[PDB]
Amino acid sequence: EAVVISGRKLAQQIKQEVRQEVEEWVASGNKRPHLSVILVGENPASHSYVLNKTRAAAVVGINSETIMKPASISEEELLNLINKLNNDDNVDGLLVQLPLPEHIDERRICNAVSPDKDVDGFHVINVGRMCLDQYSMLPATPWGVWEIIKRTGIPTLGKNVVVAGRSKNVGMPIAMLLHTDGAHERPGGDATVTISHRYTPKEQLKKHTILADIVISAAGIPNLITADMIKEGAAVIDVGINRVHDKPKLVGDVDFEGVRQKAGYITPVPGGVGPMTVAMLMKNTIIAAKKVLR
Amino acid sequence: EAVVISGRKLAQQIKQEVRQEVEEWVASGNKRPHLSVILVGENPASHSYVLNKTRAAAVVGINSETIMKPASISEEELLNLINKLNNDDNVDGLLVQLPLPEHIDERRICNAVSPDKDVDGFHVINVGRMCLDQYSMLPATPWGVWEIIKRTGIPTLGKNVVVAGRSKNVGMPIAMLLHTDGAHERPGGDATVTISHRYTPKEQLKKHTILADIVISAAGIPNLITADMIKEGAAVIDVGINRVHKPKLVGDVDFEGVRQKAGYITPVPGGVGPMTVAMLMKNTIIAAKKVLR
Ligand SMILES: O=C(O)c1ccc(C(=O)N2CCc3c(c(=O)oc4ccccc34)C2)cc1
Ligand SMILES: O=C(O)c1ccc(C(=O)N2CCc3c(c(=O)oc4ccccc34)C2)cc1
Ligand SMILES: O=C(O)c1ccc(C(=O)N2CCc3c(c(=O)oc4ccccc34)C2)cc1
Ligand SMILES: O=C(O)c1ccc(C(=O)N2CCc3c(c(=O)oc4ccccc34)C2)cc1
C-alpha cells in the first residue's frame, strides 16, 4: 500500500518553525507580527477557514484580528477598509478571504492589498514576480503542495508531473513552481509538467497521469482521480476540497480508498493539503513582518 | 505530408492590417505612432533583429528610431535613457533589444520601461496581467505563435500540446496562452499543455510529444524534434533560432524529417521569426492608441 502523508504532522512541523522564528524575532526586540483577515458575508466554509487561520496565528505567537463585514458591503467600502489596513504600520499581513460576493470585483480587491502585506500572494505584482521565478510572497496552497513534496523527499527534477486544474491561486501556481528552474532566485522543481483543466477529455488526462511520477489534483471533482489513472508507485497529492452530503462531508479529488493500493504516496482529505495551506500562510506572515522583500 | 506554413506570408498579411489600422488612426487626426528601440553593444544577431523591426515599422507607417549604446554603458545610464523615453509623449512604444551585457540587470531594465509603452510585454505588470488572463501587452513571439495557430485554423480546445522550453518571454507565455480559458478577458487556448525543458529526459520528451496534437519548440537545440517524436498529422511550430554552418540558421525541428510525418510545420528561417516582428507592430499601434491605459 501507499504511504499516507500526514498533512497535520507536516503542518505541525512548519508551525513549530514559525513559532521559533517569531520568538527569536520578538526576542531581538521587534514588534510581534500582526495578521489581519477581512471576512465578507457568511459563507460557512469561509468562516471556518478564517477560524483555522486565527487559531494557527495564535499558536505560532502571531497576533490576529478577523474583521467581518456583511455581504452587503460596497466594493468601495471594502477598498477603504483595505486602505486603512494597508496604512496601519501595525498590520504586517493583510488578506481578504475568498470568495467575495458577485458584486465585488475580486481582482480589484486583490490588487488593492499592499503587495508587501499580501500574504496570500494574489496581488498582480506577486503573481508576476512568481511567474518570473523571482522572490515573492508565494500563494499558500502551492507552497504547501511544494512543501509536502519536498518535505517527504519525493524527487521532482527530471520527473513527470500532472496538475489537474488551472485556477490562478492554486493550479497554475502549482504548475509554475513545479516546472521551473531550481537555480532561479525562487527555485522551482525542474519537473516536466502537464496542466489539465475542465476541457481535458477523460482519456487525455489518463494518458498523461499514467506517465506521471506526481499527480497533483486541484480540480474540485470527487473521484476525478481513480487508481487506473495512476502508475504504481506515483505520489498523489489531493488538493480537492469537496463538500458532499450522505451527514454533510469533506472529500478530495482522489478515490482515496482505491488509489491507496496503486500509489507510492498519497495525501488524505481532510488532513492533507488543507492544514498545510494554513501553515504556509503563517510562514508568509513572518516573512511579511520582517520586510525582507521591500 | 506537411502543409508548410509561411510565417513570412502571414506576417506580411498582418503587417497589411497594421498598415491600414495606422492609416486610419492618422487620417482620424491622431499623431502617427512612434516606436523607439534601444540597442546596446554589437551582437550581430541583435543588430539584424533591430533592422527587421525598423523595416517592419517603415512598411506599416510607424515612425522608428534606434538608439545604439556601447556595451560599456552602465545600468544606470540605461535607466536614464529609458526614463527619458518613458516621458517623451512622442514615444508610443519602447523596447530594449535583448540580450543585454552581464553587468546590466535584465529584469530591472525590463521593469524600467513604462508598462504602457512596453511593446515587448516583458514588464512585470504585463507578465502578471497575462498570467491572470487579463488584457495585457502580450509578448510578440508567443502572440505570433498563437496567430500562426489560430489563422491556420489548427484547433486547441481539448487538444494535447507540448511546449519545449520555459523561458520567461517565449516558452512560459506560450504555455500560458495555450492552456488558459477561452472565456477569460484575454482568451486562451483551452489546450492540455506539457512544459518541458533542459532537464526533460529524451525518452520523456518523446513520450509526451507522441500524444501531441501540437508541438511547439522553443529550446534552441538543432534536431530536438525528430519525426518519430511526432504523431502523424500534428502541427509542429519551430520557435528555434539556431546559428549553424557559410554561417547558417536552423530551427529545433528536423524539418526534412518531420515534414514527412506532420500535418503542418513551420520553417526556419521564414516561420515564427517574421510573426514575432509582425506582432510587435500590432503592439505598437495598440500602445499608440492607449487602449490598455
Ligand atoms: O462526465 C464524465 O464522464 C467525465 C468525468 C471526468 C472527466 C475528466 O477526467 N476531466 C474533465 C474535467 C477535468 C479534467 C482535468 O484533468 O482537470 C480538471 C480541472 C478542473 C475542473 C475539471 C477538470 C478532466 C471527463 C469526463
Ligand atoms: O484538514 C483539512 O483538509 C483542511 C484544513 C484546513 C483548511 C483551510 O482552512 N483552508 C484550505 C482550503 C481553503 C482555504 C481558504 O481559506 O479559502 C479557500 C477558498 C476556496 C477553496 C478552498 C479554500 C483554507 C481546509 C482543509
Ligand atoms: O542525445 C542526448 O543526449 C539528448 C538530446 C536531447 C534530449 C532532449 O530531448 N531534451 C534535453 C534538452 C531539452 C529538452 C526539452 O524538452 O526542452 C528543452 C528546452 C530548452 C533547452 C533544452 C531542452 C529535452 C535529451 C538527450
Ligand atoms: O525569418 C526569420 O526566420 C526571422 C525573422 C525575423 C527575426 C527577428 O527579428 N526576431 C525573431 C527572433 C528574435 C528577435 C529579437 O528581437 O530578439 C531575439 C532574442 C533572442 C532570440 C531570438 C530573438 C526578433 C528572426 C528570424
Curated annotation (Swiss-Prot), chain B:
Superkingdom to which the source organism belongs: Eukaryota
Enzyme Commission code: 1.5.1.15, 3.5.4.9
Cross-link annotation Glycyl lysine isopeptide (Lys-Gly) (interchain with G-Cter in SUMO2), location: 15
Cofactor: Mg(2+)
Binding-site positions, NAD(+): 165-167, 198
Name under which the protein is recorded: Bifunctional methylenetetrahydrofolate dehydrogenase/cyclohydrolase, mitochondrial
Organism: Homo sapiens
Binding of substrate, residues: 49-53, 96-98, 269-273
Keyword Oxidoreductase part of the UniProt annotation: yes
Gene Ontology terms for molecular function: magnesium ion binding; methenyltetrahydrofolate cyclohydrolase activity; methylenetetrahydrofolate dehydrogenase (NAD+) activity; methylenetetrahydrofolate dehydrogenase (NADP+) activity; phosphate ion binding
Gene Ontology CC annotation, any one: mitochondrion
Assembly: Homodimer.
